Write a protein that binds this DNA or RNA. Structure first.
Length: 437
RNA sequence: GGCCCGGGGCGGUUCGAUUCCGCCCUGGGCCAU
């Protein structure tokens, strides 16, 4: 029931069991055979090759080494060729460049093409660096794999384990580097409590210093930041999580938090107790990869939020959600309605020129002098958040992300009230408002 | 696709805009895959 003890039972949650490993070995086996009966120059990398793969997330990554001189196209053509001839099933996939995805003896496999190079510089694609990361990482991680797993388990369980844009957390490489630095999960957690947004971790120099931003410098590339895509808040959440784990160790930290739905009737009551405005902007999901959708949703949500605050509606928090069919931009505002008149600051009284122009615009309610300068009452074109957003989205759709914006321009609607709790956005909303229970 | 930095034109808004809201082309850097 204490630190160690818990970490004991925890392994049971993060370490792949015999049959899962056996499935993987036999798959690795076959794969190696097929690549040889064709005699290609390949190298297995990633967590499978270093036995740092988290339980239930088996996936083999085979990198195909190609001569420097080979043209970009040759790598991909031949890359696809090899993948097809060795994979039971094959489905081309994309990233920096196209690669191949499939299955062998029932396990996931990624066949990527890269340049067999020497020494970190000369790296052409990002994937060209992976081979190095593997070299640098294999000798050093040995005998600590289970540590890399506890860490991956911890993060994954609190939704901060991926480094892709839909998570902005810790990548698997970052995780090992951490273990290779602190020595184990417990040490990583223990020290993480003292981490700050100005913390720099230089693996290669075994040093920790103060920088301008959280920076884990790549053993292979001193300029590169491995935690480049880790959000300031996710950084913060982890530091807070580690502080709690040490405070009250628990096996719960390794268990995926239960979905915990809420009846739409309880949610309506809560919004009533909060007396706020709760609405969402719905639109068709652009058929694009997640790495493109979310950075866009984030922006879209940001722009409308910012429109909301300068517009005086006192937004409290924003939030977004994507489904197979639509995307929802959720908001909560302190102001359900606002007067139609508002005051506009004008020039200082002794500026005859500007004052004259200021008083030249005919308005309905006659400007006045207050504390040295002129003011005018003006009228709003809208008086509720929803009204304003309907106005904003219609005219600034183009500012919400290339794709998200093209979708909103063609179709969008604002939901709220009962009709909104029907939508598949209750968790995000509960998450947004800190609903607890 | 998104973020950062920087140029050249514009639009709207405003008494007043390089300085708010945005659109054109445009240069470098970074991120996820």
């Amino acid at each position: 029931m204490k630190v160690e003890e818990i970490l004991e039972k925890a392994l049971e949650l993060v370490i792949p069991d015999e049959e899962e490993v056996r499935k993987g070995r036999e798959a690795e086996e076959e794969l190696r055979r097929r690549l040889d009966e064709l005699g290609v120059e390949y190298v297995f990398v990633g967590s499978y090759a270093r036995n740092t793969w988290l339980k239930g997330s088996l996936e083999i990554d085979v990198f195909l080494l190609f001569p420097e001189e080979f043209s970009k196209e040759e790598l991909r053509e031949r890359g696809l060729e090899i993948g097809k001839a060795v994979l039971d099933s094959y489905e081309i996939r994309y990233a920096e460049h196209p690669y191949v995805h499939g299955v062998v003896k029932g396990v996931e496999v990624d066949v990527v093409p890269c340049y067999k190079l020497k020494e970190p510089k000369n790296i052409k694609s990002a994937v060209d660096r992976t081979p190095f990361h593997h070299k640098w990482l294999e000798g050093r991680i040995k005998g600590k794999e289970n540590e890399v797993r506890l860490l991956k388990g911890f993060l994954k369980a609190n939704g901060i384990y991926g480094a892709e844009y839909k998570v902005r957390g810790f990548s698997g490489y970052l995780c090992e580097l951490l273990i290779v630095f602190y020595g184990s999960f417990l040490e990583t957690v223990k020290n993480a409590r003292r981490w700050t947004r100005r913390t720099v971790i230089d693996v290669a120099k075994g040093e920790v210093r103060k920088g301008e931003e959280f920076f884990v410098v790549d053993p292979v590339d001193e300029k590169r930041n491995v935690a480049a895509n880790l959000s300031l808040d996710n950084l913060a959440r982890f530091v807070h999580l580690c502080r709690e784990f040490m405070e009250a160790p628990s096996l719960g930290f390794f268990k995926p938090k239960h979905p915990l739905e809420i009846e739409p009737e309880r949610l309506r009551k809560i919004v009533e107790e909060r007396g706020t405005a709760v609405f969402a902007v719905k639109f068709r999901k652009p058929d694009i990869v997640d790495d493109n959708l979310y950075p866009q949703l984030e922006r879209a949500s940001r722009k409308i939020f910012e429109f909301l605050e300068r517009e005086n509606f006192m937004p409290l928090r924003s939030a977004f959600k994507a489904s197979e069919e639509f995307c929802y931009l959720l908001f909560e505002c302190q102001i359900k309605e606002i007067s139609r008149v508002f005051r506009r600051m004008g020039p200082q009284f002794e500026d005859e020129r500007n004052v004259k122009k200021f008083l030249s615009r005919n308005r309905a309610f006659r400007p006045f002098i207050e504390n040295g300068r002129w003011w005018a009452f003006e009228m709003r074109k809208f008086t509720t958040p929803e009204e304003g957003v309907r106005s904003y989205a219609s005219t600034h759709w183009h500012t919400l992300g290339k794709n998200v914006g093209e979708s909103i321009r063609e179709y969008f609607e604002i939901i709220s009230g009962e009709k909104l709790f029907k939508e598949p956005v209750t968790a995000e909303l509960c998450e947004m408002m800190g609903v607890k229970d």
